[PDB]
Paper text:
We hypothesized that engineering a reversible interaction between a FP and fluorescently labeled SLP would enable the straightforward development of FRET biosensors with large dynamic ranges. In conclusion, ChemoX is a chemogenetic platform of FRET pairs that enables the development of biosensors with high dynamic ranges attributed to the reversible interaction of FPs with a fluorescently labeled HaloTag.
Because of its chemogenetic nature and involvement of eGFP, this design was named [name]. The eGFP surface residues Y39, K41 and F223 form a salt bridge with the carboxylate of the fluorophore (K41) and π-stacking interactions with the fluorophore benzyl (Y39) and xanthene (F223) moieties.
Author numbering: 3 to 63, 67 to 229, 237 to 529
The structure:
């Protein structure tokens, strides 16, 4: 069943409803892509005007399209029931108002995933939030809690939807849900876990009928708390006539620890790692030029531009010796600086770092087509600059766990204006993949050669399946690099700091205590 979801799947939804005697029908069409947990659908009220608010129908109107992480695939009941499908039953209690009772069958009909529903609503107030149409046309993010019902060979599901009301209040809709397979075959019965959801509601400007356009992303989580705050005072330094922002905490003496982020992040990516190190060592975490809270001049934002500014940042702070903690393009900066200043580097901690990627075969299959499209002057700028895909989509797809709205808004803040998105597009176009661009390939080969000969203490973090660093490569490097300790962080893609910050931070702290600094 799970193999039926490896690509984009067309969806059809049909709803027959009756709420307080008002009969109506809704039809929907679109597609789902479980790789991304994604649904893109358009729903039409085929009987006229919808007698209830469109948001009240979102949960009723295909959880088999949820993004289940690799390490949780044995917990995905929904896909395991396919193609024969499952019955989905709910009662939805609208607080201080009526209730919906729904029964749906979700199954494949040919190549199409179909959700057919009957809905009955009763006991609603004619002047309440639902029949009075007092709900805002928007939708919140929720946790959907799933447990097995071993006796009934299905699952029990519970969650509370928060509907924003036009007077600023919130109307709760308490969801009680049961799913049972239609077929007679066995299914996966999961351990307790949850789905983290988000939904975006919009309108079709050319559609005359009452309708709803829906974009939804859902990732499963909860099988094996992470701070969202950024409690660091801003520090600024003039670098090459531009102001760069940096975190600066911990004791003033000793060897400083320099944390370098990559694409599309900022010093925010280090927020839950720095507190493990600050007790014993100075922590300096700059925002790269063009990113975070640093100034954003009109540059090409080639790697060489970042080299120039980071060189000058390090000198501006008068750093002499450093320990480097580096990630993604921050690792290219850190390694390239170490190669040129080996006497000044007392240790390198690194993770998901820039290495020569010899063939596209080594790039994750699920992200291969998108990064190839990023690496163009037309389509790639449309995606990254015009549509902000690297922030809105590639960033969440580089983290195994769900990124919360607060965390997303921290990552979004530097790039609300499309003109400032140049570094987000130039960075993937600098990645050394399949020999191009040759100048980056040559630079990265040089610092990898240096790394293989240098005695500097090394700490390598890696996760499964990773993105830049497959687990087999991390293992090979741990065995071949001198004075290298390797730490498996568990599940992870690219931003390993977001999937296991406590292990990364505590192991850096312990490793620092073993250095002769
Ligand atoms: Cl990149």
């Amino acid at each position: 069943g799970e193999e039926l979801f490896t690509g984009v799947v067309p969806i059809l939804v049909e709803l027959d409803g009756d709420v307080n005697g008002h009969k109506f029908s809704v039809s929907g069409e679109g597609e789902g892509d479980a790789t991304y947990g994604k649904l893109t659908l358009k729903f039409i009220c085929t009987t006229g005007k919808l007698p209830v608010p469109w948001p009240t129908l979102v949960t009723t109107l295909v959880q088999c399209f949820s993004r289940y992480p690799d390490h949780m695939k044995q917990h995905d009941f929904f896909k395991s029931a396919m193609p024969e499908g499952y019955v989905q039953e709910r009662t939805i209690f609208f607080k201080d108002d009526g209730n919906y009772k729904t029964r749906a069958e979700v199954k494949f009909e040919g190549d199409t995933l179909v959700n057919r529903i009957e809905l009955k609503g009763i006991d609603f107030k004619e002047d309440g939030n639902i029949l009075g149409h007092k709900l805002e046309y928007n939708y919140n993010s929720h946790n959907v809690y799933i447990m097995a019902d071993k006796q009934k060979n299905g699952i029990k599901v519970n969650f509370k939807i928060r509907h924003n009301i036009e007077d600023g209040s919130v109307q709760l809709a308490d969801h009680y849900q049961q799913n049972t397979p239609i077929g007679d075959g066995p299914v996966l019965l999961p351990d307790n876990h949850y789905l983290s959801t988000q939904s975006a509601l919009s309108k079709d400007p050319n559609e005359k009928r009452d309708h709803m356009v829906l974009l939804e992303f859902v990732t499963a989580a909860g099988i094996t708390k992470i701070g969202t705050g950024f409690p660091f005072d801003p520090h600024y330094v003039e670098v090459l006539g531009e102001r760069m922002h940096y975190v600066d905490v911990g004791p003033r003496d000793g060897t400083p620890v320099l944390f370098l982020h990559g694409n599309p992040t900022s010093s925010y990516v280090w927020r839950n790692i720095i507190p493990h190190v600050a007790p014993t060592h100075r922590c300096i975490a700059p925002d790269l030029i063009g990113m975070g809270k640093s100034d954003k001049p009109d540059l090409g934002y080639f790697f060489d531009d970042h080299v120039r500014f980071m060189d000058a940042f390090i000198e501006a702070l008068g750093l002499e010796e450093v320990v480097l903690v580096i990630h993604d393009w921050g690792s290219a900066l850190g390694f390239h600086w170490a190669k040129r200043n080996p006497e000044r580097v007392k240790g390198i901690a690194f993770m998901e770092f820039i290495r020569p990627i010899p063939t596209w075969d080594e790039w994750p299959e699920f992200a291969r087509e998108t990064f190839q499209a990023f690496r163009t002057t037309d389509v790639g700028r449309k995606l990254i600059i015009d549509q902000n895909v690297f922030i809105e989509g590639t960033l969440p797809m580089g983290v195994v766990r769900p990124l919360t709205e607060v965390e997303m808004d921290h990552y979004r803040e530097p790039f609300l204006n499309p003109v400032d998105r140049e570094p987000l597009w130039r960075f993937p176009n600098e990645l050394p993949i399949a020999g191009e661009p040759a100048n980056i390939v040559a630079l990265v080969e040089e610092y990898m050669d240096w790394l293989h000969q240098s005695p500097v203490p090394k700490l390598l973090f890696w996760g499964t399946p990773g993105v830049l660093i497959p687990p087999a490569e991390a293992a090979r490097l741990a065995k071949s690099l001198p004075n290298c300790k390797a730490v498996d962080i568990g599940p992870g893609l690219n931003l390993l700091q977001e999937d296991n910050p406590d292990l990364i931070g505590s192991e850096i702290a312990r490793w620092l205590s073993t250095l002769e600094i």
